[PDB]
């Protein structure tokens, strides 16, 4: 497509909501291929991640961790404008896993504080992806820190199964996990520090550890949990996007299964079917399907049980219904 | 519909220790069964290497791993689980291949000087962990042992990609455990008297990420020596492997997988001539395989430093005619 | 086949070039079954591994880390001269996760120094495979020490895709990740030694706590950039074989993809594909064919970020070529 046959091309404006909701989109492309226009302003903040007050200097993307999920149809173009606001202090850019060229857009896209630049790509591959900061130098300093996302490219014609069933997800979920590296003191508390820059020499340290001290969803220990878990209904189908920047994890939703996961996160690859536990390695996003089948409280974890269970990385669902007592019954209630 | 459900054969199988299993058929025999199953959970302090170092474990049945159960596609499972009184702790179980009630977790909440019954529909087809799950306590009880595997086999048996039967000859079952044991300042394992005294030591190890030991069957060296599992030449194995916890890479040393269902789910086609398959914590994978020369195998997680630092490694002792063919000492080590 | 139909045979000796290089072959198999004949000195050295001189006693199959990439094709005979000699201080041997038999080859290849031995198999199964050293009681230590490698085993028809169409690379590449285990003082300085055996039971305290001190592809922090970066052109379709002897990795092509992977490393179970970031357990090889659309340079990773950028995983591909704007541009570069 030459540069006239894009300028012809019909543009929209999308409006990013925070994960774990995705903005409104359609799972069967409408019309031709669109460029497709995203803005997001980089936020260094303070983030609290877990109960007793920890902080963190984070990245973050649309002011948020994880970064917002784009969603598009293969063959678009996405076309972000990315602001770096002059009351940030660092440099930061733009990797899209999903694109083609200049270190996945991170070489075109490095904007120091007071600048911004737009980047557009032909998402020519359908999937997940990952998108993350990538400041040559300091990078996985800057994804740690919660500089990281993901982009859903949908097919054309929507999902499908290995076998050209139609797939179709009443809704949809952004778990994004961040693991987080949170130096402490000789008393084993953790430290806080007046600028992200402070906190560098010492958090490169815990890094080579190779051993976070968290492991979260959605920015913080227990942040899907409460009047924030995740909601659906008996006979619903959802999909679960998961996505992993720096380190392995291994999704799990307990009471359910994943009845089909492109555990690569790319559509073209056909999904396994009746997972029990799917696997996504660092630098990568995956996607679940499942429909509901019991009503209740669930858990969807990084199966890790330390990880989930200790160090953060848990959710929960709330799922309204009638039971089904053909597919689990109590026979005889715990009882002497 | 209530009425058939009810009506279907009822059916009480008796369990066996890994790496073994109990009787079963490959292909379903008759219709839809319930397979009742009983298991006691045992709390007992075990002893897990050659320098004495003892864990307080949860075992599922006596044993850690727990055993192996088989049932197949859209039979049911119901599991008797008691919790005698001489033990400390509420138990539960969590079946992965279970749908609802944290797979059954939620409904099987039992005291000591308790019992339930828990049944379910095995509507998916492959091998599922199973494990321990009491609400705030989830990784002790499931790193201090308490955890096994089911085998959800298709009703027509075991098949390949192309859709031609695979049937084995024989069936283990390997249960890879990490362990989180407490050192002192001197860096020897601590003893302790009851489970409660070693949780606080316990998780400051667990959150390092990092086991003391990874073992087979509850012990380093547990399936090696005179405990070596056994094949002959010609003969096909599948061998399921579980780990409730922590990733784990296995490979047979001198063979391969011929056929592997990493992710453990027979819907979904195994992959083939893996030399090393990757089964992620939280699951239960299976690999196919024929004999084709005799002698020591080591069946190992091929991070050789869990393998033979860590403890995470087995032995095969396969009879039969070696087959220059496959493989030859043109030149045997001379100077 | 029998001793004598064997005997038969055609021979044909090969002469190995070091990673990350592969000697020359054919993808598709000219003619029927040979025996391929190899050899290998082992080499005990040491190597720098870090700008700081740090050290290890390496394990160098012919020479380098990790050892050369070996290829045949399905039904051939690998037929291997492994020497150790005079020199060095150490039994060693060969295990082929290619082969079937006595540990690999590994129970009939134990050569003390000034011994050699010569080992054949039947290269019955297609893929990508691991080779390494493993001493009864010592196997680990010999592995981390950089004794590993892999060899290719080709389809007699060479590779296709999951359908039956023929994929052809122009060029490949073999990449060995290497984890090292280095000693430090209480002051944090690695330690030196004069011998092998010298560094034993230290190293083995640092095996144990599972976190490498280093990661590192081709036996060093940036052995394969600068005058060591991997090139192609656009248009190029290339190959690159990846390994890891004892520890998991992820691998992703920062700014490419994996258009084909297999990441079991078996080429009778049909790739994956769109792939962003993949993943080879410890103890297997993988391989990725890529076909290049973009100019520049790209980053070639373990995608643990810290494993990359901080422990010494990253390697960089240079490639020629036109910018292709439809794929990628810079719509506003970077500006106030
Ligand atoms: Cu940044
Ligand atoms: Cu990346
Ligand atoms: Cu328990
Ligand atoms: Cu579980
Ligand atoms: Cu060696
Ligand atoms: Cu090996």
Redesign the interface.
Known sequence: ???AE?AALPRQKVELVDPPFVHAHSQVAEGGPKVVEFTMVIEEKKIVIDDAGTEVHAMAFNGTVPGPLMVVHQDDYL?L?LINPETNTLMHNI?F????????????????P?????????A????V??YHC?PPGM??WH??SGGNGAIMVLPREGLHDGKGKALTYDKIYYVGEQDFYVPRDENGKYKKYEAPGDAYEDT?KV?????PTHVVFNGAVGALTGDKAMTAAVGEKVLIVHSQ????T?P?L????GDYVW????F??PP????????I?????GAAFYTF??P????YVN?????????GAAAHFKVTGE??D???????????
Request: hydrophobic share 40%; proline share 4%; glycine share 14%.
């Open positions: 497509a030459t540069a894009i076309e404008t990797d896993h999903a694109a083609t060229g200049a270190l996945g857009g991170g070489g075109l896209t490095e904007i120091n007071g600048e911004k630049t737009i980047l557009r790509f032909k020519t591959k359908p999937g992806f990952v990538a990078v996985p994804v740690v490169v890094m080579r550890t190779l051993t920047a720096n380190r392995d291994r799990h307990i009471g359910g299964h555990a690569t996160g790319k073209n690859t396994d079917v009746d997972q029990e536990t799917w696997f390695p660092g630098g990568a996003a089948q019991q209740g409280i669930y858990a199966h890790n049980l330390i990880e989930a269970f200790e160090l039971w089904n053909d597919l689990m019954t109590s026979v005889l209630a715990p009882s002497g």
